Design goal:
Length: about 475
């Protein structure tokens, strides 16, 4: 994911592509903050293509909608031509880069939060590599920056700290007394104690910190390019709401027509899915039935900004309907401020004794773009959903959907996973928002779409702990 440059202007991108690139050379960069630009070189000229994400997907002008920037790039490199990634040498979005950090503060972080192999890189004009080895000691290796090249005092001269770090991660430096300076894992600094969320929120709200953390998490999406073959099959193309927003094969829900654009999310489990198409309503009820799901969370309106987001897959109040071999009665509709509750009874046609109540919680006030200004409403909604799920003996995974099932769906599931830790373990527990996001993202592409949603998750968690 070296083709992503986090701090460059359009003019900087043009000079990079014109003097250091060739025709087919490309880079992606953040632009209107919240938007992205794909800068491509074609016939000695640089073209700037806008990528927009309001929280649902990455919408590329002239192209398609995607779950990640790494998925967008992979698709266009495997299918204006993107031939050559122009690699960024800036270490800002690397998990191990700490910029300004003292040798005492870095030794303090590594002593408290570190283990064998924990390393970091910090900053006159030179850098320091601080590593922990044992079960124990902390070693500091100087990194000279000579003529825009990096070295440890001998041997190879690297063009970037990333190239130096990856080389010594594969071929570790051995101290001339036996110690192998193993660079196993970057030091974990994102994990906070639940009780100190307000201190972290304040630190991340400073010049912004939330953007710096979200973008470091985004640089790890390249490790999540898992196969999505079943969703690419001819027979399954029109079962997808967005052609390239597909479920991973290793986590996809298999129906025992075995396909649905849904994935199991394991932290209480979830099924993260897209908004129904008219041709997928029957597949959706077969999923709910097979998975013994008793609660559905819908986080979109049927129609948003004049576009359909999910077809009406449930009957009108008091009506009874058949969806293939599935049968749904809408027993009762209850309305609250932020949402609607629908009591549905699901059964298999011809088999009365298969009946179960399915509670549909439909959140109706999420803004068309961005996030709600206060997380109170979402939290009250998640609280009520949790209690319904917990009250039902041996209930299957909670079904969660929006339009593509990655943005709002990913936000709701992540808040819910985090809140759950605080329910069982209490205000005296460890919470790690990006580790948790990365974990859910390995189960469905691009779960949690924007920095606004990312900030919303911290704020939601902050509010839950405060109202305790
Ligand atoms: C403020 N600067 C100067 C210091 C600083 C602070 C925090 C980080 C940091 C940010 C991260 O954003 N996602 C992950 C992540 C990715 C994959 C898996 C798990 C995780 Cl936690 C992540 C991470 O690991 N680290 C360490 C890096 C540098």
């Amino acid at each position: 994911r070296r083709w992503f440059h986090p701090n460059i202007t359009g003019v900087e991108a043009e000079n990079l592509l014109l003097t250091r690139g060739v025709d087919g050379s490309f880079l992606a960069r953040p632009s209107n903050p919240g938007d992205f630009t794909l800068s491509v070189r074609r016939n000695g000229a640089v073209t700037h293509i806008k990528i927009q994400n309001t929280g649902d997907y990455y919408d590329l002008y002239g192209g398609e909608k995607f779950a990640t920037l790494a998925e967008l790039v992979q698709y266009y490199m495997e299918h204006i031509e993107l031939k050559y990634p122009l690699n960024c040498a800036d270490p800002t979005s690397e998990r191990w880069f700490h910029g300004h950090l003292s040798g005492k503060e870095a030794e303090k972080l590594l002593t408290e939060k570190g283990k064998h192999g924990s390393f970091l890189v910090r900053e006159p004009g030179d850098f320091v590599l601080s590593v922990r080895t044992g079960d124990s000691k902390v070693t500091h290796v100087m990194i000279r920056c000579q003529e825009l090249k990096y070295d440890v005092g001998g041997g190879e001269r690297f063009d970037s700290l990333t190239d130096l770090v990856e080389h010594y991660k594969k071929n570790p430096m051995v101290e001339t007394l036996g110690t192998v300076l193993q660079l196993k894992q970057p030091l974990n600094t994102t994990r906070i104690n639940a009780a100190e969320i307000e201190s972290r929120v304040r630190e991340l709200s400073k010049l912004q910190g939330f953007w710096e953390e979200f973008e470091t998490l985004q640089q790890q999406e390249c490790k999540l390019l898992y196969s999505r073959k079943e969703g690419q099959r001819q027979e399954n193309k029109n079962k997808n709401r967005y052609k390239n927003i597909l479920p991973f094969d290793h986590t996809r829900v298999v129906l025992h027509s075995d396909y649905i654009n849904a994935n199991i999310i394991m932290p209480k489990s979830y099924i993260a899915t897209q908004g129904c198409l008219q041709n997928t309503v029957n597949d959706f009820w077969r999923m709910v039935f097979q998975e013994n799901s008793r609660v559905i969370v819908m986080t979109t309106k049927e129609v948003e900004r004049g576009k359909s987001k999910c077809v009406k897959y449930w009957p009108d109040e008091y009506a009874l309907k058949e969806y293939g071999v599935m049968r749904v009665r809408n027993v009762k509709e209850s309305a609250a401020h932020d949402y609607t509750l629908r009591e549905l009874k699901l059964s298999k046609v011809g088999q009365g004794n298969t009946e179960r109540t399915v509670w549909q919680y439909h959140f109706r006030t999420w803004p068309d773009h961005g996030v709600p200004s206060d997380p109170g409403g979402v939290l009250d909604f998640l609280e009520e959903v949790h209690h319904k799920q917990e009250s039902i003996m041996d209930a299957g995974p909670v079904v969660v959907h929006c339009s593509a099932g990655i943005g709002r769906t990913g936000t709701f599931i992540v808040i819910d996973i985090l809140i759950d830790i605080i329910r069982e373990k209490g205000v005296d527990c460890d919470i790690d928002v990006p580790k948790t996001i990365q974990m859910v993202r390995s189960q469905r592409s691009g779960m949690v779409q924007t920095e606004a949603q990312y900030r919303f998750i911290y704020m939601a968690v902050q509010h839950y702990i405060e109202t305790l």
